[PDB]
Design an enzyme around this catalytic site. Structure first.
Site, PDB file in Angstrom:
ATOM      1  N   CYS A 158       0.870  -1.170   0.000  1.00 29.49           N
ATOM      2  CA  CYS A 158       0.000   0.000   0.000  1.00 29.49           C
ATOM      3  C   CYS A 158       0.913   1.228   0.000  1.00 29.49           C
ATOM      4  CB  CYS A 158      -0.868  -0.039   1.258  1.00 29.49           C
ATOM      5  SG  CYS A 158      -2.069   1.267   1.434  1.00 29.49           S
TER       6      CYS A 158
ATOM      7  N   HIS B 222      -9.668  -4.025  -1.205  1.00 22.40           N
ATOM      8  CA  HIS B 222      -8.547  -3.282  -0.640  1.00 22.40           C
ATOM      9  C   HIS B 222      -8.910  -1.794  -0.628  1.00 22.40           C
ATOM     10  CE1 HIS B 222      -4.111  -2.395  -0.104  1.00 22.40           C
ATOM     11  NE2 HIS B 222      -4.555  -1.225  -0.522  1.00 22.40           N
ATOM     12  N   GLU B 223      -9.538  -1.337  -1.713  1.00 19.50           N
ATOM     13  CA  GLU B 223      -9.921   0.067  -1.826  1.00 19.50           C
ATOM     14  C   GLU B 223     -11.111   0.388  -0.937  1.00 19.50           C
ATOM     15  OE1 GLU B 223      -7.872   2.056  -3.110  1.00 19.50           O
ATOM     16  OE2 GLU B 223      -6.725   0.331  -3.846  1.00 19.50           O
TER      17      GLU B 223
ATOM     18  N   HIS C 114     -10.189   1.079   2.532  1.00 18.61           N
ATOM     19  CA  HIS C 114      -9.676   2.426   2.763  1.00 18.61           C
ATOM     20  C   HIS C 114     -10.750   3.441   3.147  1.00 18.61           C
ATOM     21  CE1 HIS C 114      -5.397   2.416   2.170  1.00 18.61           C
ATOM     22  NE2 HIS C 114      -5.464   1.867   0.971  1.00 18.61           N
TER      23      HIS C 114
HETATM   24  C1  LIG Z   1      -3.890  -6.210  -4.216  1.00 19.94           C
HETATM   25  C2  LIG Z   1      -4.814  -5.231  -3.565  1.00 19.94           C
HETATM   26  C3  LIG Z   1      -4.798  -3.840  -4.201  1.00 19.94           C
HETATM   27  C4  LIG Z   1      -3.489  -3.114  -3.956  1.00 19.94           C
HETATM   28  C5  LIG Z   1      -3.604  -1.595  -4.191  1.00 19.94           C
HETATM   29  C6  LIG Z   1      -2.214  -0.893  -3.931  1.00 19.94           C
HETATM   30  C7  LIG Z   1      -2.454   0.652  -4.183  1.00 19.94           C
HETATM   31  C8  LIG Z   1      -3.090   1.281  -2.933  1.00 19.94           C
HETATM   32  O1  LIG Z   1      -2.298   1.681  -2.051  1.00 19.94           O
HETATM   33  N1  LIG Z   1      -4.410   1.379  -2.834  1.00 19.94           N
HETATM   34  O2  LIG Z   1      -5.005   1.861  -1.874  1.00 19.94           O
HETATM   35  C9  LIG Z   1      -1.164  -1.553  -4.859  1.00 19.94           C
HETATM   36  O3  LIG Z   1      -1.188  -1.441  -6.082  1.00 19.94           O
HETATM   37  N2  LIG Z   1      -0.244  -2.256  -4.225  1.00 19.94           N
HETATM   38  C10 LIG Z   1       0.829  -3.034  -4.841  1.00 19.94           C
HETATM   39  C11 LIG Z   1       0.486  -4.523  -4.595  1.00 19.94           C
HETATM   40  O4  LIG Z   1       0.267  -4.905  -3.444  1.00 19.94           O
HETATM   41  N3  LIG Z   1       0.441  -5.356  -5.647  1.00 19.94           N
HETATM   42  C12 LIG Z   1       0.691  -4.976  -7.078  1.00 19.94           C
HETATM   43  C13 LIG Z   1       0.519  -6.280  -7.827  1.00 19.94           C
HETATM   44  C14 LIG Z   1      -0.274  -7.186  -6.924  1.00 19.94           C
HETATM   45  C15 LIG Z   1       0.129  -6.787  -5.502  1.00 19.94           C
HETATM   46  C16 LIG Z   1       1.311  -7.640  -5.016  1.00 19.94           C
HETATM   47  O5  LIG Z   1       1.046  -8.655  -4.308  1.00 19.94           O
HETATM   48  C17 LIG Z   1       2.220  -2.668  -4.259  1.00 19.94           C
HETATM   49  C18 LIG Z   1       3.299  -3.409  -5.063  1.00 19.94           C
HETATM   50  C19 LIG Z   1       2.466  -1.172  -4.304  1.00 19.94           C
HETATM   51 CO   LIG Z   2      -3.740   1.020  -0.128  1.00 19.78          CO
END
Ligand SMILES: CCCCC[C@H](CC(=O)NO)C(=O)N[C@H](C(=O)N1CCC[C@H]1CO)C(C)C
Ligand SMILES: [Co+2]
Length: 205
Positions: free
Chosen positions: A130, A173-174, A177
């Site tokens: 996040c 996840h969103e 928030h």
């Molecule tokens: C999976 C649930 C949704 C995650 C959303 C977050 C973005 C965020 O902070 N939203 O509030 C993100 O892209 N996070 C990434 C993330 O956790 N990811 C990106 C690919 C899938 C997953 C890794 O396990 C990290 C790398 C910054």
């Molecule tokens: Co987040």
């Protein structure tokens, strides 16, 4: 206020606009948005979608120093409103070819709500990250495997959609928030990688 600065035509959302762990806004319960949607809110949503698009543009992300993200909620940019943006990308095939369609799901949801879900749970095998959290918390983030979401789009039209797999994970996840919930809140602290037959493990590759 913060939203006012964010909707400035020439303003680009960057890591500088993302509040981090510590700011009480992250733990507040975002307020619903009035209908019909007022200019401010619609413009904010677009700014959020544009942020995601820039984060997934390798060159742009590299230039702006952004972390690739697949979703974002208003509270994360210090605006306690029930507005979320999702941009879930398709991955390349086994052969290495680029996906036929860049995105699997692209949407800005207003006042989203989960109406029903599967009995089974699901978690990304690699855990979750996040941008509002500057640290790593390993473990399975337990979410519903499948959910049905009701929300209003930017046009102001009400929708009900059935999500599963990666889409279901991102939307929850969103939605978390806007309710003051962070991903690590859903990780079993006593056993981060605890498993159960009812817990599906998703590999994105
Ligand atoms: C999976 C649930 C949704 C995650 C959303 C977050 C973005 C965020 O902070 N939203 O509030 C993100 O892209 N996070 C990434 C993330 O956790 N990811 C990106 C690919 C899938 C997953 C890794 O396990 C990290 C790398 C910054
Ligand atoms: Co987040």
């Amino acid at each position: 206020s913060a939203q006012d600065k964010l909707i400035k035509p020439s303003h680009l959302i960057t890591m500088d606009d993302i509040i981090r762990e510590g700011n009480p806004t992250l733990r507040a319960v975002a307020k619903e948005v009035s209908l019909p949607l007022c200019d401010e809110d619609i413009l904010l949503g677009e700014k959020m979608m544009q942020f995601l698009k820039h984060s997934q543009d390798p060159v742009m992300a590299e230039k702006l120093g952004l972390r690739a993200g697949v979703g974002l909620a208003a509270p994360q940019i210090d605006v306690s409103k029930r507005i979320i943006a999702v941009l879930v990308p398709n991955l390349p095939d086994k052969e290495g070819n680029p996906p036929k369609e860049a995105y699997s799901w692209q949407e800005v949801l207003y006042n989203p709500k989960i109406v029903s879900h599967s009995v089974q749970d699901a978690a990304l095998s690699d855990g979750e990250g996040c941008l509002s959290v500057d640290r790593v918390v390993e473990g399975y983030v337990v979410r519903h495997a499948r959910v049905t979401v009701d929300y209003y789009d930017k046009e102001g039209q009400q929708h009900r959609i059935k999500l599963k797999g990666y889409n279901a994970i991102v939307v929850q996840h969103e939605i978390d928030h806007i309710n003051g919930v962070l991903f690590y809140d859903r990780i079993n602290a006593k056993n981060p990688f605890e498993t159960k037959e009812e817990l599906l493990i998703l590999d994105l590759e």
